[PDB]
């Protein structure tokens, strides 16, 4: 069904929440009606991205300490790394409430050249010096910025209280910054030498340089990126009725379709002209449906209307008028069924809440639509995609009966694998649903009478008395129906005479 997967813990760069309860349109219409074409819009919220770069250094002491990251001064980035691709050995850091300087393997000051740190390109390149001791590291991490483009965060999860458009070169969002000017610099004419080959870039560029007390960052700078529409064309409905009741207009389409509700007041975004692109797309979609289905059936009247419907949906409506029976009950049945579905799903949302706390990996993956890593950071969930690995590069250990701790051995099989075919091999533990844990910690007081199975590739791997026996295909185990279609075989008794 799928290959193996390795899911490192998420760094919190991207956080996700639940859709929360939704208001169901309990009444299945039945009052006065009006016709018109419809197209709904919603918050575009497209976040800006830029493949920034992170620079920092590791510091340690040979005391049988207090290790933590350290930033890279701007002069060192443009002189040793940008020109020679080397890093300084000495680095100062607080040690037991007082500053102290480190060295490269307690030696004199020296320049250490940077080399790749991934061992095989499976993700971003990344570079390092060595696998008191000091190590210089550089990484081309990814970044995201919220819709207002006022703040951004890197892959490491540390928020940067500064807008990506910051810069004194021209008129930009230079007023948004919480850090002091001493922590920022904009290098002009930057030629961006690469650490993979040291071949220099193709043309000069202006690069912003900022550094928090934990590290140093940088990325190519441009004046501003205002090319973005506030709303996005979500759905285009061919037929949508406009009903009136309860002091709030109702916009409903086919029975199973979702019904919208508004305040009856025309929103001022279109008439203010700030949503020019929204009107253009809406008008194009409106004319598209009319010529596609109603040239001689209806007649367009007035101009498109806009409303900030419930739930944040921006509905664009265009009234229509007609130029000129068994469906009556069934429509009421289907409508009631749809409301039951909305109410039932609303209840199911509660069940999903405890499910995530119990198992965030499987729940987060199925909800988003793919194998993804996740852990609950309180009332909000963290998300980060997983890396895949082929079956050939994975092999289960012969036995989990770790002799180091008799009477208490691993409960799940220990697995050995390699990220890349030519890369080095690693050891870990086989989790649930082909999840290759990067660590081995599933200890259990192993006792007599053990006989279990574990998911492995397409089939299962048998085990008994904590020792590998053989594999077992999918069809080797009986299957039961954990469902109910729109329209059994179980037997055997226990050994009471044990």
């Amino acid at each position: 069904d799928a290959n193996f997967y390795v899911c490192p813990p998420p760094t919190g760069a991207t956080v996700v929440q639940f859709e929360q309860p939704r208001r169901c349109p309990t009444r299945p219409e039945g009052q006065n009606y009006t016709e018109g074409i419809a197209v709904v819009f919603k918050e575009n919220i497209a976040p800006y991205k830029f493949k920034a770069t992170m620079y920092y250094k590791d510091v340690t002491v040979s005391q049988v300490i207090f290790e933590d990251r350290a930033p890279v001064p701007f002069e060192e980035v443009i002189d040793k790394i940008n020109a020679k691709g080397v890093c300084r050995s000495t680095a100062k850091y607080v040690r037991n409430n007082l500053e102290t300087t480190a060295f490269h393997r307690d030696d004199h000051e020296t320049d250490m050249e940077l080399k790749p740190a991934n061992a095989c390109t499976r993700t971003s390149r990344g570079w390092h010096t060595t696998d008191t001791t000091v190590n210089c590291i550089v990484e081309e991490v990814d970044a995201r910025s919220v819709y207002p483009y006022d703040e951004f965060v890197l892959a490491t999860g540390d928020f940067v209280y500064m807008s990506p458009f910051y810069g004194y070169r021209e008129g930009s969002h230079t007023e948004h910054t919480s850090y002091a000017a001493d922590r920022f610099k904009q290098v002009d004419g930057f030629y961006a030498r690469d650490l993979t080959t040291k071949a220099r870039a193709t043309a000069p560029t202006t690069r912003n340089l900022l550094t928090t007390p934990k590290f140093t960052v940088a990325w190519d700078w441009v004046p501003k990126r205002p090319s973005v529409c506030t709303m996005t064309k979500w759905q285009e409905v061919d037929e949508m009725l406009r009903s009136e009741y309860g002091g709030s207009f109702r916009f409903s389409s086919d029975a199973i379709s979702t019904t919208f509700t508004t305040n009856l007041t025309e929103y001022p975004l279109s008439r203010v002209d700030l949503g020019d692109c929204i009107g253009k797309d809406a008008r194009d979609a409106m004319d598209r449906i009319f010529a596609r289905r109603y040239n001689a059936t209806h007649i367009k009247v007035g101009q498109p209307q806009y409303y900030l419907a419930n739930g944040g949906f921006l509905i664009a409506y265009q009234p229509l008028l007609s130029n000129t029976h068994i469906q009556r009950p069934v429509n009421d049945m289907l409508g009631r069924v749809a409301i039951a579905w909305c109410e039932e799903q609303n209840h199911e949302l509660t069940l999903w809440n405890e499910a995530r706390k119990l198992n965030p990996n499987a729940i987060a993956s199925v909800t988003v639509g793919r194998r993804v890593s996740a852990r609950m950071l309180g009332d909000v969930m963290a998300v980060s995609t997983c890396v895949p690995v082929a079956a050939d590069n994975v092999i289960v250990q012969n036995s989990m009966r770790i002799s180091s701790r008799p009477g208490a051995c691993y409960s799940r099989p220990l697995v050995s694998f390699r990220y890349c075919d030519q890369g080095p091999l690693v050891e870990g533990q086989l989790g649930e649903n082909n999840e290759l844990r990067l660590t081995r910690d599933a200890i259990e007081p192993c006792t007599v009478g053990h006989r279990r199975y574990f998911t492995f590739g397409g089939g299962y791997v048998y085990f008994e008395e904590y020792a590998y026996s053989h594999q077992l295909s999918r069809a080797d185990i009986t299957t039961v129906s954990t469902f109910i279609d729109l329209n059994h075989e179980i037997k055997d008794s226990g050994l009471l005479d044990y």
Partner: antibody
Framework: VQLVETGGGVVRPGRSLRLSCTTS????????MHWVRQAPGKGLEWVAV????????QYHDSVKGRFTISRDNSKNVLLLQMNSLRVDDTAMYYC?????????????????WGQGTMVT | VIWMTQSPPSLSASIGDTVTITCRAS??????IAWYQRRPGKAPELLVY???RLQSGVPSRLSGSGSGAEYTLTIKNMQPEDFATYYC?????????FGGGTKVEIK
């Protein structure tokens, strides 16, 4: 159905003017209303629009701000006001009733007019 | 602003002829345009809405057509009351704008 405009007259540029249009013979409360301008011997050119309820108003770019439109169903009258008329503003004015299609819509057109009032 | 043109400004005809007028908008409104006519010494009166619908009083020999930005109004037969002026009015985008118009007179 008929409409009557009042308040016109020969006026030099550089001052304000107030005019209105009364309505009769139809459901003024349930219908929107228009205002049009026509220079001497030239074509027609729109001025403003007021819905049946009066919560939404639109104007022509050449008269936005300089002109205002207001209505009142209790006295079935359409009131308009403006300030500092220019020489090019010399034109014939009328109050036009919007084409009636549905109560919850504005046709952005018109089907009935009034006698009109001239301003120069 | 959306502009349009109407031609000819005036034409000479007689009872029993066939004539057609065209209104060409500056953009693809595709359906939002109306037509009007006016008798001398009298307020104008409407002809067509959305280029296809008619109203009360207009004879059956009146009918419009068009698409995109090209729109026309057809009069199948001339009568004594047809010697007047006609115009096109768009309502696709604000502000509303009128066309150049046309005129008709006896030969």
């Amino acid at each position: 159905v008929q409409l009557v405009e009042t308040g016109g007259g020969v006026v030099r540029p550089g001052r304000s003017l107030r005019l209105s249009c009364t309505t009769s013979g139809f459901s003024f409360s349930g219908s929107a209303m228009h205002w049009v301008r026509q220079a001497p011997g030239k074509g027609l050119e729109w001025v403003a629009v007021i819905s049946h309820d009066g919560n939404i108003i639109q104007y022509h770019d050449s008269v936005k701000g300089r002109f205002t439109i207001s209505r009142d169903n209790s006295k079935n009258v359409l009131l308009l006001q403006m300030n500092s008329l220019r020489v090019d503003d010399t034109a014939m004015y009328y109050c036009a009733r919007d084409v009636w299609l549905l109560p919850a819509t504005i046709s952005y057109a018109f089907d009935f007019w009034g006698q009109g009032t001239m301003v120069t | 602003v959306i502009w349009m043109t109407q031609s000819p400004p005036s034409l000479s005809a007689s009872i029993g002829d066939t004539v057609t007028i065209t209104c060409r908008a500056s953009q693809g409104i595709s359906n939002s345009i109306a037509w009007y006519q006016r008798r001398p010494g009298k307020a104008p009166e409407l002809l067509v809405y959305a280029a296809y619908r008619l109203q009360s009083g207009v004879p059956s020999r009146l009918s419009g057509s068009g698409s995109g930005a090209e729109y026309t109004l057809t009069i199948k037969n001339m009568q004594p009351e047809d010697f007047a002026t006609y115009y096109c009015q768009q309502y696709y985008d604000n502000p509303l704008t009128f066309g150049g118009g046309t005129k008709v007179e006896i030969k």
